[PDB]
Amino acid sequence: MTLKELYAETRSHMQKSLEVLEHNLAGLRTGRANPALLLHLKVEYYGAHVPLNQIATVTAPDPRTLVVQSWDQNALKAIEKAIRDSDLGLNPSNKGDALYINIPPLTEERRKDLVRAVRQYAEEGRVAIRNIRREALDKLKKLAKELHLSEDETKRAEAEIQKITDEFIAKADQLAEKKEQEILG
RNA sequence: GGGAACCUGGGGAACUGAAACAUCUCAGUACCCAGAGGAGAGGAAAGAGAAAUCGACUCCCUGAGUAGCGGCGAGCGAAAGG
RNA sequence: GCGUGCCUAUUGAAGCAUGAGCCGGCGACUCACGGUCGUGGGCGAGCUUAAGCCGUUGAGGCGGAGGCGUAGGGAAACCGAGUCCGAACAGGGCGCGUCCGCGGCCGUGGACCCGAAACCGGGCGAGCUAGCCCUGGCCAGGGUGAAGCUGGGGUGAGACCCAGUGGAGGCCCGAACCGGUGGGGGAUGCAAACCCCUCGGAUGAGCUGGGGCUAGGAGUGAAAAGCUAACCGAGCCCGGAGAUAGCUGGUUCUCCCCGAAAUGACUUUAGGGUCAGCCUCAGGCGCUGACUGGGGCCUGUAGAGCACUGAUAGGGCUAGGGGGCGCCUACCAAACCCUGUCAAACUCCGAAGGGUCCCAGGUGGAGCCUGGGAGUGAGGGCGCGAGCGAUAACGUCCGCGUCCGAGCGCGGGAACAACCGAGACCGCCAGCUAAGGCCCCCAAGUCUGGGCUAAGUGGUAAAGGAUGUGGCGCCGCGAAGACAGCCAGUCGAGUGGCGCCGCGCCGAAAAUGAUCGGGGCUUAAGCCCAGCGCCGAAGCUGCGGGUCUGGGGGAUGACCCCAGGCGGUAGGG
RNA sequence: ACCGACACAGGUGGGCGGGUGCAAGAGCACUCAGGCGCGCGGGAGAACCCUCGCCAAGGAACUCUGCAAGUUGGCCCCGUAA
RNA sequence: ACAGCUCUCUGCGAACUCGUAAGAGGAGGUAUAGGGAGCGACGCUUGCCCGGUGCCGGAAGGUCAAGGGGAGGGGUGCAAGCCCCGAACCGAAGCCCCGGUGAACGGCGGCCGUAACUAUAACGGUCCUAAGGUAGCGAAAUUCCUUGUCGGGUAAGUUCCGACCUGCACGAAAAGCGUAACGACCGGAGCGCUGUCUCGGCGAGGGACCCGGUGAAAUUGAACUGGCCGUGAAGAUGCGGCCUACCCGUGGCAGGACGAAAAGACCCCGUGGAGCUUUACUGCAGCCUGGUGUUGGCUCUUGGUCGCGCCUGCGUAGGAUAGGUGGGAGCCCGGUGAAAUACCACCCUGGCGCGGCUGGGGGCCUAACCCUCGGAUGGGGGGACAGCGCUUGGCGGGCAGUUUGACUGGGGCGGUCGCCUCCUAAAAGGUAACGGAGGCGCCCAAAGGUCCCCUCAGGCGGGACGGAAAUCCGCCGGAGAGCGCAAGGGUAGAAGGGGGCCUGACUGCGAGGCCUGCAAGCCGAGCAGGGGCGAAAGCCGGGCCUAGUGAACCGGUGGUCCCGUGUGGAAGGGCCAUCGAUCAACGGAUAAAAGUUACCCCGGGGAUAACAGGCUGAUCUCCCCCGAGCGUCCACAGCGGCGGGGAGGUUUGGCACCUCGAUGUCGGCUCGUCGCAUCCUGGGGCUGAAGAAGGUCCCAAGGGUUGGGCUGUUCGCCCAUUAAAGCGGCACGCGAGCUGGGUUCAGAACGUCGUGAGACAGUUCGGUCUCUAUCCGCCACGGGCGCAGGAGGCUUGAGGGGGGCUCUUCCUAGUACG
Ligand SMILES: [Mg+2]
Ligand SMILES: [Mg+2]
Ligand SMILES: [Mg+2]
Ligand SMILES: [Mg+2]
Ligand SMILES: [Mg+2]
Ligand SMILES: [Mg+2]
Ligand SMILES: [Mg+2]
Ligand SMILES: [Mg+2]
Ligand SMILES: [Mg+2]
Ligand SMILES: [Mg+2]
Ligand SMILES: [Mg+2]
Ligand SMILES: [Mg+2]
Ligand SMILES: [Mg+2]
Ligand SMILES: [Mg+2]
Ligand SMILES: [Mg+2]
Ligand SMILES: [Mg+2]
Ligand SMILES: [Mg+2]
Ligand SMILES: [Mg+2]
Ligand SMILES: [Mg+2]
Ligand SMILES: [Mg+2]
Ligand SMILES: [Mg+2]
Ligand SMILES: [Mg+2]
Ligand SMILES: [Mg+2]
Ligand SMILES: [Mg+2]
Ligand SMILES: [Mg+2]
Ligand SMILES: [Mg+2]
Ligand SMILES: [Mg+2]
Ligand SMILES: [Mg+2]
Ligand SMILES: [Mg+2]
Ligand SMILES: [Mg+2]
Ligand SMILES: [Mg+2]
Ligand SMILES: [Mg+2]
Ligand SMILES: [Mg+2]
Ligand SMILES: [Mg+2]
Ligand SMILES: [Mg+2]
Ligand SMILES: [Mg+2]
Ligand SMILES: [Mg+2]
Ligand SMILES: [Mg+2]
Ligand SMILES: [Mg+2]
Ligand SMILES: [Mg+2]
Ligand SMILES: [Mg+2]
Ligand SMILES: [Mg+2]
Ligand SMILES: [Mg+2]
Ligand SMILES: [Mg+2]
Ligand SMILES: [Mg+2]
Ligand SMILES: [Mg+2]
Ligand SMILES: [Mg+2]
Ligand SMILES: [Mg+2]
Ligand SMILES: [Mg+2]
Ligand SMILES: [Mg+2]
Ligand SMILES: [Mg+2]
Ligand SMILES: [Mg+2]
Ligand SMILES: [Mg+2]
Ligand SMILES: [Mg+2]
Ligand SMILES: [Mg+2]
Ligand SMILES: [Mg+2]
Ligand SMILES: [Mg+2]
Ligand SMILES: [Mg+2]
Ligand SMILES: [Mg+2]
Ligand SMILES: [Mg+2]
Ligand SMILES: [Mg+2]
Ligand SMILES: [Mg+2]
Ligand SMILES: [Mg+2]
Ligand SMILES: [Mg+2]
Ligand SMILES: [Mg+2]
Ligand SMILES: [Mg+2]
Ligand SMILES: [Mg+2]
Ligand SMILES: [Mg+2]
Ligand SMILES: [Mg+2]
Ligand SMILES: [Mg+2]
Ligand SMILES: [Mg+2]
Ligand SMILES: [Mg+2]
Ligand SMILES: [Mg+2]
Ligand SMILES: [Mg+2]
Ligand SMILES: [Mg+2]
Ligand SMILES: [Mg+2]
Ligand SMILES: [Mg+2]
Ligand SMILES: [Mg+2]
Ligand SMILES: [Mg+2]
Ligand SMILES: [Mg+2]
Ligand SMILES: [Mg+2]
Ligand SMILES: [Mg+2]
Ligand SMILES: [Mg+2]
Ligand SMILES: [Mg+2]
Ligand SMILES: [Mg+2]
Ligand SMILES: [Mg+2]
Ligand SMILES: [Mg+2]
Ligand SMILES: [Mg+2]
Ligand SMILES: [Mg+2]
Ligand SMILES: [Mg+2]
Ligand SMILES: [Mg+2]
Ligand SMILES: [Mg+2]
Ligand SMILES: [Mg+2]
Ligand SMILES: [Mg+2]
Ligand SMILES: [Mg+2]
Ligand SMILES: [Mg+2]
Ligand SMILES: [Mg+2]
Ligand SMILES: [Mg+2]
Ligand SMILES: [Mg+2]
Ligand SMILES: [Mg+2]
Ligand SMILES: [Mg+2]
Ligand SMILES: [Mg+2]
Ligand SMILES: [Mg+2]
Ligand SMILES: [Mg+2]
Ligand SMILES: [Mg+2]
Ligand SMILES: [Mg+2]
Ligand SMILES: [Mg+2]
Ligand SMILES: [Mg+2]
Ligand SMILES: [Mg+2]
Ligand SMILES: [Mg+2]
Ligand SMILES: [Mg+2]
Ligand SMILES: [Mg+2]
Ligand SMILES: [Mg+2]
Ligand SMILES: [Mg+2]
Ligand SMILES: [Mg+2]
Ligand SMILES: [Mg+2]
Ligand SMILES: [Mg+2]
Ligand SMILES: [Mg+2]
Ligand SMILES: [Mg+2]
Ligand SMILES: [Mg+2]
Ligand SMILES: [Mg+2]
Ligand SMILES: [Mg+2]
Ligand SMILES: [Mg+2]
Ligand SMILES: [Mg+2]
Ligand SMILES: [Mg+2]
Ligand SMILES: [Mg+2]
Ligand SMILES: [Mg+2]
Ligand SMILES: [Mg+2]
Ligand SMILES: [Mg+2]
Ligand SMILES: [Mg+2]
Ligand SMILES: [Mg+2]
Ligand SMILES: [Mg+2]
Ligand SMILES: [Mg+2]
Ligand SMILES: [Mg+2]
Ligand SMILES: [Mg+2]
Ligand SMILES: [Mg+2]
Ligand SMILES: [Mg+2]
Ligand SMILES: [Mg+2]
Ligand SMILES: [Mg+2]
Ligand SMILES: [Mg+2]
Ligand SMILES: [Mg+2]
Ligand SMILES: [Mg+2]
Ligand SMILES: [Mg+2]
Ligand SMILES: [Mg+2]
Ligand SMILES: [Mg+2]
Ligand SMILES: [Mg+2]
Ligand SMILES: [Mg+2]
Ligand SMILES: [Mg+2]
Ligand SMILES: [Mg+2]
Ligand SMILES: [Mg+2]
Ligand SMILES: [Mg+2]
Ligand SMILES: [Mg+2]
Ligand SMILES: [Mg+2]
Ligand SMILES: [Mg+2]
Ligand SMILES: [Mg+2]
Ligand SMILES: [Mg+2]
Ligand SMILES: [Mg+2]
Ligand SMILES: [Mg+2]
Ligand SMILES: [Mg+2]
Ligand SMILES: [Mg+2]
Ligand SMILES: [Mg+2]
Ligand SMILES: [Mg+2]
Ligand SMILES: [Mg+2]
Ligand SMILES: [Mg+2]
Ligand SMILES: [Mg+2]
Ligand SMILES: [Mg+2]
Ligand SMILES: [Mg+2]
Ligand SMILES: [Mg+2]
Ligand SMILES: [Mg+2]
Ligand SMILES: [Mg+2]
Ligand SMILES: [Mg+2]
Ligand SMILES: [Mg+2]
Ligand SMILES: [Mg+2]
Ligand SMILES: [Mg+2]
Ligand SMILES: [Mg+2]
Ligand SMILES: [Mg+2]
């Protein structure tokens, strides 16, 4: 309706496009010495792919492994029933109310199968935003042309978007930016 | 054919002014062409204009910046009669 | 010792804004006809003549056509000291010189003087340059080797293939010839388009000699708005023409008097103008002026205040509403109540002030009236009060005021339009004072008592730190003699604690060489509270002199006394 | 001696335009016939500039850019890809 | 430009062009040709949308200018008359309307939902359209984010090439995608070779310099012309305090004299100027078009129409095809109906019958006009047409003259432009800003006059339908209701709520004020005239009150007395009443008007922008306070919430004070110099310091602070090293020292917007950078004099300047610590 609520409907409409970015990184075979790499998992349970960060508690004991202290025995049961079913290629455990799964890093060829695809979400992410800028500015057009402004009352708008788009595009380049280390280094 | 201007006919601007500008103005000016000559034109009423009047024409002074004309603006502007 | 050129334009210039090498000459508010005034004469209920006519050879008459003036009022008819609107016989609106000379200003003409970009007419150019027509030349040498023909090959006949001859082409290489790619030079040149190296085309849409043709809103153009006689978005010359310029510049002798504005209103107006405001001169009226005292009103700001309007933190009381809902539990939460507050657009209340009317003082480059001449209509700083700004700006708009402008004349402030003092006729080798100062530069107290400060603070900064120092307080409570060390007695006294006042330290880094104006100051040459004295300006007295008004001498003699004003740009006299 | 304000480093159509050598030629070099030595000179031997010759090693690090400069260059003969 | 493609025009006296015309090109041509337009060999191709626009086609209708036409009206004369307006209706072109048309101007979308991992969406629903971009191409001479991501080339590649397509904003004849051959065209690589460079050196010639001859120019207030901190109109040789410094030159260097040269080219202002554009205004040329003059014959055929002759009207009964009103009875009523006939009439309805006056059409003609033919007194063909005169209406950037407002913290854009109500506003008024927050361009025949009465809003209880208000009753409540609508003031002792009569919401006027520059606006006593209500004293010339509106000019309607061009009356004026304005840019230039320039010009300005300086310091970089809370314990080893205080003038800004008769504007090169907040190397302090390393704070600039790739880049980003590869000041130092890659002149193109000419803080290739230094300053080298005799030598050094760096390794010692 106006720049006021708009400049915020971008910092809200760009948020999500960023969201997924994080999402598509953890789903990646990093040093896999992290728990979150699991919780996202849509685990089929009681008739609904239910995110693991809701069916249990994953926390890697040490670097070399993770534990899913799955409260209810049964839950844990139908849990493995999905952490493996991921092409990845791991194997957990039916030990106690928890799930012991190893973390085995691998070859360089495994680095391209991980690093290359990342410098790909690097795009899907930067871009998803690029559009929240394209689609933004356009409503900024019809806006000050409906509402009346100055060729400058508008530039202020026009570039603010830009400073916002740029501000958010950072929480991306710079985001994955770190995990790239957890992957590489 | 020529002739310093001066005169008549045939054509004929704009800048300007109106504090813009198109009617209007400058202006029938400038200039162009023809023609007449010591001058040229005009000249004996199919006039004038309200006076039982006047009596070819042309020039001067008044009439008069009047009567009027006018995007009733800028501005233009007679005639009878004396 | 003291001292920032001249003009110009400006809120403001020495200005690092404008113009000017220097000297001499030329060089800009005029005339004509109308108007409006003031003024010197003539004639007066009238005054005066235009063209023309007669005389003159630097004689003046005559000429009353005509023009103003004697009545105004009404759109007009018309009426008339009235008239007009009107039914009114209410009312209301309008009511007494010419002719010359001269000065001021206005209208009109180029009308203060220069200066455009352009516009319009008539002409002059294609001996440059563009296109084209006619008639003539020119293009070393080398290269590749098309079509054609001819001989052989193949076929049913062919097509088609081979050699050979042959000599095509907006073909190739490269001089002349015609261009002008890239670079350097040249840049008051060799030259207002050049030179050197380099590079393109060179039988073609080629280059060139002579003769011809098309032109100014026109030509011509392998197209750039290119070219048309070295500048072309419309050539050149001549005339209209002294186009117009709400802009820029310039605008000449002296002394005297007064002196602005930089605002309001309306402007296709906003750096212009019309009216008003403010200056000035004339004549007219004469204490009403500015300012002050005393009285009587209107008034709604500074404060303050919640009675309205609204906002407000908390607490109580209590709807209705959360959560168990039945009791209860959190002001989560309306009105109400106190408790404390907030507000340009709230005020129960309300100042000081301001304004205004009658009376009183008030003789002043006061006012009030009629009129001639204006300029100005960018303002700027500073105090105060408000907006905008960010409780920013040498910011910005307003308000009272002031000062600069125009007081850049003088002292102080180091230097400096507006900060302090203070209104500069002139002259003097006099004297006392303002502001500021009084140790040396530099005038006058290293003046006198009384403290404070040790950082050069002074000599120019904050929140906030800190037993820096000097001076006050009330608090403990130490013979129920610990406050500091050594087992606590001896030791036998000033030790803890907050918190106020003065000066001070830290906090605290900037760009060419440093500093408070310099030197140099510490019981000061700093700072605070006292006291007497000097210095110091163009301020005021002293002596003399110039000048204009006002007021008396006065025998006008313009000739001495008397009391005042005399900075000044635009401007007026 | 013509057009360029000049005794101008620019411009101006046609014919002749020798010899030797170089693949040829009106190209280049030298020189016949012929003409000229450009209407200020003399010295010195710095910076710097103009125009010109050279370089160790490196060989585009230069720079906007190999701009410039260098390399290659004639003829004969092989031999020449997409 | 080009061949070549396409659309289009043109039947010959061609179209088109020049010209007033004659005439001429066209062309001594004839559609296999000529003109106009776009595209630009050649290969494959060239989609969809005729709603709007243009053009082609439509013998019907709609509208329409003259002219024809005259029902009807007015003016005058005693009149025959003469004069005027004047409806029907017939009337071109154009426009409207109906079709067609894209190698004509042009145009060629969006929003929801859905696949058994997810994603995504072939598929569905839906909104609008004239129809929603096909082939091919794609971060491109087009891609804003952008150096998009990947891959290749490189040590390293914002460029380049290959891909992906999320095409800000390709795309089919302003052509699309390709293409061998071609280019002094623009980009990326290589190899060869070099002074281009690291990195500078030597040498040659012509100048520069010295000597003899000749001998300029721009500029120039006057000169006796130094540095620093200050200062001043805010960048000083010329003021102030201080600091230096003998006089005068020769060769050089360029930092300064805001150096010179151009009355700034950008910027704005001027109601300044030109070239251009169009669906801005207005006209002109030309073209189309009706009537006519030129201009005539003979026929065919239908109109409008006035003279006339005639026939002509079938409601229900009916003597039945009554038109109508009169006369009227021999050439009938009757009976009945709305009306009675046998007959003569005057006329509405309507058609035919011979004439007039005029019209329109379609034919043939020849003899005017035209063109032609071995030279014609004539013959061919066209033919009342064409051409030409006049007049009617329209098309008409082809051409012309012009208009395209102002304010405004430059301008443009956005906003506003008059009136009303508060505050601002400092206790009379008044009063600024693009200051804060709202209204008006009306409404009322009752909402008005006056007389007569009556009184709210809310609150609490009682109450049939009944919220928390319908309507009743009951107390209480001075004002918070109401007062037509904004706001303020006022108000119940009425302006409010209700009832009764009325139309003073009059005509004549107006003492006297308010306000005020003018002109406008504002209240209004009372007299006269005739009225309304009231018993009356009395009130009523509009509305509780301020907004609710517009000078004159020009026309329009009414009326009255005045004028009425020899006189009379008219035509037409005046006076009075009243009307036509978003003249709303609202004190109003015209009846009448938009753009554009980088093709541009003049006059002006630092009255006003961009660069730079200055003031400011929000923003900016920096350091400081308070100390939540992180640090395994523990505010400060290292950190710091929310919050607060300052410093600096390097960022982005605000202001517009110098300079617009000119202060050359990014980057690079060269030469630097200064600050410390320090990147190295020196010292030191704590450390959550073992050592070796670091972290962090404190001192401290003396000196150092590399070479490359990319980009114009500064800045970054990488490659290889380093003790380190520090930030910032000097007009973001430095163009009279160089460079011009960037950027802002003219050329061209892409995307883009625009109908257009042209435009763009978009791109892209191109594109002129001025021999002489006089003064200050600086580098060198002199002449003069001075230094109280005149000399030849050798030194003293007050004073200044140059220079100061840093790494690696080996011993100590593999020791100390571990
Ligand atoms: Mg003659
Ligand atoms: Mg005019
Ligand atoms: Mg006009
Ligand atoms: Mg005109
Ligand atoms: Mg004679
Ligand atoms: Mg005669
Ligand atoms: Mg006769
Ligand atoms: Mg005469
Ligand atoms: Mg008269
Ligand atoms: Mg006469
Ligand atoms: Mg001096
Ligand atoms: Mg002047
Ligand atoms: Mg100024
Ligand atoms: Mg000077
Ligand atoms: Mg200047
Ligand atoms: Mg000067
Ligand atoms: Mg000037
Ligand atoms: Mg001179
Ligand atoms: Mg002189
Ligand atoms: Mg007068
Ligand atoms: Mg007199
Ligand atoms: Mg006489
Ligand atoms: Mg009357
Ligand atoms: Mg001009
Ligand atoms: Mg002309
Ligand atoms: Mg001629
Ligand atoms: Mg010629
Ligand atoms: Mg010629
Ligand atoms: Mg050739
Ligand atoms: Mg050429
Ligand atoms: Mg060649
Ligand atoms: Mg010739
Ligand atoms: Mg040509
Ligand atoms: Mg062109
Ligand atoms: Mg020329
Ligand atoms: Mg004239
Ligand atoms: Mg003049
Ligand atoms: Mg004087
Ligand atoms: Mg005075
Ligand atoms: Mg105006
Ligand atoms: Mg005035
Ligand atoms: Mg106040
Ligand atoms: Mg409450
Ligand atoms: Mg309350
Ligand atoms: Mg008195
Ligand atoms: Mg007085
Ligand atoms: Mg003013
Ligand atoms: Mg001003
Ligand atoms: Mg100010
Ligand atoms: Mg003064
Ligand atoms: Mg002076
Ligand atoms: Mg001074
Ligand atoms: Mg004085
Ligand atoms: Mg002394
Ligand atoms: Mg003394
Ligand atoms: Mg003491
Ligand atoms: Mg520092
Ligand atoms: Mg000192
Ligand atoms: Mg004392
Ligand atoms: Mg005296
Ligand atoms: Mg006296
Ligand atoms: Mg005085
Ligand atoms: Mg004066
Ligand atoms: Mg005077
Ligand atoms: Mg010449
Ligand atoms: Mg010459
Ligand atoms: Mg010579
Ligand atoms: Mg010569
Ligand atoms: Mg020749
Ligand atoms: Mg040879
Ligand atoms: Mg030769
Ligand atoms: Mg010579
Ligand atoms: Mg070498
Ligand atoms: Mg070497
Ligand atoms: Mg390089
Ligand atoms: Mg480089
Ligand atoms: Mg580069
Ligand atoms: Mg390049
Ligand atoms: Mg490059
Ligand atoms: Mg080269
Ligand atoms: Mg190849
Ligand atoms: Mg092949
Ligand atoms: Mg055609
Ligand atoms: Mg012919
Ligand atoms: Mg083309
Ligand atoms: Mg095909
Ligand atoms: Mg269409
Ligand atoms: Mg159609
Ligand atoms: Mg048709
Ligand atoms: Mg007619
Ligand atoms: Mg009659
Ligand atoms: Mg028609
Ligand atoms: Mg969906
Ligand atoms: Mg499913
Ligand atoms: Mg669908
Ligand atoms: Mg679609
Ligand atoms: Mg399709
Ligand atoms: Mg593509
Ligand atoms: Mg792409
Ligand atoms: Mg790229
Ligand atoms: Mg491409
Ligand atoms: Mg883009
Ligand atoms: Mg590589
Ligand atoms: Mg695009
Ligand atoms: Mg598109
Ligand atoms: Mg198409
Ligand atoms: Mg097209
Ligand atoms: Mg292509
Ligand atoms: Mg080329
Ligand atoms: Mg070097
Ligand atoms: Mg030499
Ligand atoms: Mg200074
Ligand atoms: Mg210099
Ligand atoms: Mg000069
Ligand atoms: Mg100028
Ligand atoms: Mg100019
Ligand atoms: Mg301009
Ligand atoms: Mg012109
Ligand atoms: Mg017949
Ligand atoms: Mg008839
Ligand atoms: Mg009859
Ligand atoms: Mg019956
Ligand atoms: Mg009978
Ligand atoms: Mg009839
Ligand atoms: Mg015939
Ligand atoms: Mg015939
Ligand atoms: Mg005809
Ligand atoms: Mg035009
Ligand atoms: Mg206008
Ligand atoms: Mg502005
Ligand atoms: Mg007041
Ligand atoms: Mg007041
Ligand atoms: Mg309104
Ligand atoms: Mg009422
Ligand atoms: Mg009810
Ligand atoms: Mg209303
Ligand atoms: Mg009534
Ligand atoms: Mg009354
Ligand atoms: Mg009323
Ligand atoms: Mg008018
Ligand atoms: Mg009119
Ligand atoms: Mg008459
Ligand atoms: Mg208007
Ligand atoms: Mg106005
Ligand atoms: Mg008005
Ligand atoms: Mg008008
Ligand atoms: Mg251009
Ligand atoms: Mg040009
Ligand atoms: Mg052009
Ligand atoms: Mg031009
Ligand atoms: Mg200024
Ligand atoms: Mg600050
Ligand atoms: Mg903070
Ligand atoms: Mg602060
Ligand atoms: Mg600064
Ligand atoms: Mg400025
Ligand atoms: Mg300045
Ligand atoms: Mg000058
Ligand atoms: Mg200047
Ligand atoms: Mg320690
Ligand atoms: Mg340093
Ligand atoms: Mg660079
Ligand atoms: Mg790389
Ligand atoms: Mg620097
Ligand atoms: Mg130079
Ligand atoms: Mg320069
Ligand atoms: Mg310079
Ligand atoms: Mg460039
Ligand atoms: Mg260039
Ligand atoms: Mg460029
Ligand atoms: Mg531009
Ligand atoms: Mg377009
Ligand atoms: Mg080039
Ligand atoms: Mg220059
Ligand atoms: Mg020299
Ligand atoms: Mg030393």
PDB file of N, CA, C and O (backbone and C1' of nucleotides) and ligand atoms in Angstrom, chain B residues 64-65, chain C residues 67-68, ligand 9:
ATOM      1  P     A B  64     -13.880  72.281 -32.721  1.00  0.00           P
ATOM      2  O5'   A B  64     -12.338  72.163 -32.327  1.00  0.00           O
ATOM      3  C5'   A B  64     -11.919  71.428 -31.169  1.00  0.00           C
ATOM      4  C4'   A B  64     -10.688  70.613 -31.485  1.00  0.00           C
ATOM      5  C3'   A B  64      -9.395  71.366 -31.792  1.00  0.00           C
ATOM      6  O3'   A B  64      -8.318  70.601 -31.272  1.00  0.00           O
ATOM      7  C1'   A B  64      -9.927  69.943 -33.583  1.00  0.00           C
ATOM      8  P     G B  65      -7.371  71.206 -30.119  1.00  0.00           P
ATOM      9  O5'   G B  65      -6.553  69.927 -29.645  1.00  0.00           O
ATOM     10  C5'   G B  65      -7.175  68.878 -28.875  1.00  0.00           C
ATOM     11  C4'   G B  65      -7.835  67.869 -29.790  1.00  0.00           C
ATOM     12  C3'   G B  65      -8.199  66.536 -29.145  1.00  0.00           C
ATOM     13  O3'   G B  65      -9.416  66.113 -29.760  1.00  0.00           O
ATOM     14  C1'   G B  65      -6.938  66.144 -31.050  1.00  0.00           C
TER      15        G B  65
ATOM     16  P     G C  67     -12.824  78.491 -31.470  1.00  0.00           P
ATOM     17  O5'   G C  67     -11.469  78.729 -30.676  1.00  0.00           O
ATOM     18  C5'   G C  67     -10.388  77.789 -30.766  1.00  0.00           C
ATOM     19  C4'   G C  67      -9.472  77.961 -29.587  1.00  0.00           C
ATOM     20  C3'   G C  67     -10.207  77.953 -28.257  1.00  0.00           C
ATOM     21  O3'   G C  67     -10.346  76.623 -27.771  1.00  0.00           O
ATOM     22  C1'   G C  67      -8.794  79.843 -28.378  1.00  0.00           C
ATOM     23  P     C C  68     -11.542  76.256 -26.768  1.00  0.00           P
ATOM     24  O5'   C C  68     -10.793  76.140 -25.375  1.00  0.00           O
ATOM     25  C5'   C C  68     -11.289  76.804 -24.236  1.00  0.00           C
ATOM     26  C4'   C C  68     -10.163  77.491 -23.520  1.00  0.00           C
ATOM     27  C3'   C C  68     -10.626  78.269 -22.306  1.00  0.00           C
ATOM     28  O3'   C C  68     -10.738  77.404 -21.179  1.00  0.00           O
ATOM     29  C1'   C C  68      -9.225  79.643 -23.637  1.00  0.00           C
TER      30        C C  68
HETATM   31 MG    MG F   9     -12.078  72.936 -27.524  1.00  0.00          MG
END
